[PDB]
């Protein structure tokens, strides 16, 4: 479970996921998996994606993860009167602005990479596209 | 600053406090009401304030 160690506050405000992403290009890898929609990405959904995706490359090349949850979602226990403080920390999730580059890879065949990311999209709750690290 | 014709084209019910205060500043009371003033940037600003609901003729 990708999770923030040594944090300052335990719970934070929900905020709004407006605006557009900053990490628009593929820095590390040669190809990227840039997202289309606007949504949330839990730590579990990252594991479902990456682990299932790394099997496609078959232990070849390196996978660069360009995201981190760093935001705790608190939910109330079942059968609880509405009110009386915020709920307990349930998990972690990252806020993704459209056009965000999520994964990077290199030392991998184009079509294998094209297919590996296809499998990754299945576990991801956000629409995405296959992009490559373009020159300049 | 010659004469300038200003007319009201919409209501003042669902309007902003500033807009309401501005509309009475122009003197326009009822809808379709006409009025005459002197063309100056001060008035032009007010004209620009409620342009969405005002028909202006020179």
């Amino acid at each position: 479970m990708l999770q923030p160690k040594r944090t300052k506050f335990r719970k934070m405000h929900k905020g709004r996921n407006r605006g557009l992403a900053q990490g628009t290009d593929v820095s590390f890898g040669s190809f990227g998996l840039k997202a289309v929609g606007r949504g949330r990405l839990t730590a579990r959904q990252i594991e479902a994606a990456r682990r299932a995706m790394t099997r496609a490359v078959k232990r070849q090349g390196k996978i660069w993860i360009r995201v981190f949850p760093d935001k705790p979602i608190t939910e109330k226990p079942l059968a609880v009167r509405m009110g009386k403080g915020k709920g307990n920390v349930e998990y972690w999730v990252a806020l993704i602005q459209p056009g965000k580059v999520l994964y990077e890879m290199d030392g991998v065949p184009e079509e294998l990479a094209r297919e590996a990311f296809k499998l990754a999209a299945a576990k991801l709750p956000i629409k995405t596209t296959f992009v490559t690290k373009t020159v300049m | 600053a010659k004469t300038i014709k200003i007319t009201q084209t919409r209501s003042a019910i669902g309007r902003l406090p500033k807009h309401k205060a501005t509309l009475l500043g122009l003197g326009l009371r009822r809808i379709g009401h006409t009025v005459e003033r002197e063309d100056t940037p001060a008035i032009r600003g007010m004209i620009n304030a409620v342009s969405f609901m005002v028909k202006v003729e020179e």
């Binding site: 557009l20 992403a21 628009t24 840039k34 997202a35 289309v36 459209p98 056009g99 596209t129 992009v131 020159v135 300049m136 | -």
Partner: protein, 94 residues
């Protein structure tokens, strides 16, 4: 080398830009030396096919504007977030 028949921008601004960006065209800019920077307007589609080559950011390009062909160079580019499109391209007069 790549000849670009671009038009001088009539008006700059946020509204005008998106207005012509909907018209399959997008704005650009040029500068370099003591000369005055000029607001350049051109197509996006065909130019999109031009920048597909890596040599597009190394070649001393030639943008012809109403007879006046300027030898320019591609400094930097501003793209669209997710859709494979362009926003604006910086052109250094070379």
């Amino acid at each position: 080398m790549f000849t670009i028949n671009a038009e001088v921008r009539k008006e700059q601004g946020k509204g005008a830009s998106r207005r012509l960006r909907a018209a399959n065209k997008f704005p650009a800019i040029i500068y370099g030396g003591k000369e005055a920077p000029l607001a350049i307007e051109l197509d996006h589609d065909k130019v999109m096919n031009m920048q597909a080559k890596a040599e597009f950011y190394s070649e001393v390009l030639t943008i012809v504007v109403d007879g006046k062909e300027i030898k320019v160079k591609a400094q930097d580019v501003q793209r669209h977030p997710y859709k494979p499109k362009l926003q604006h391209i910086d052109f250094v007069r070379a």
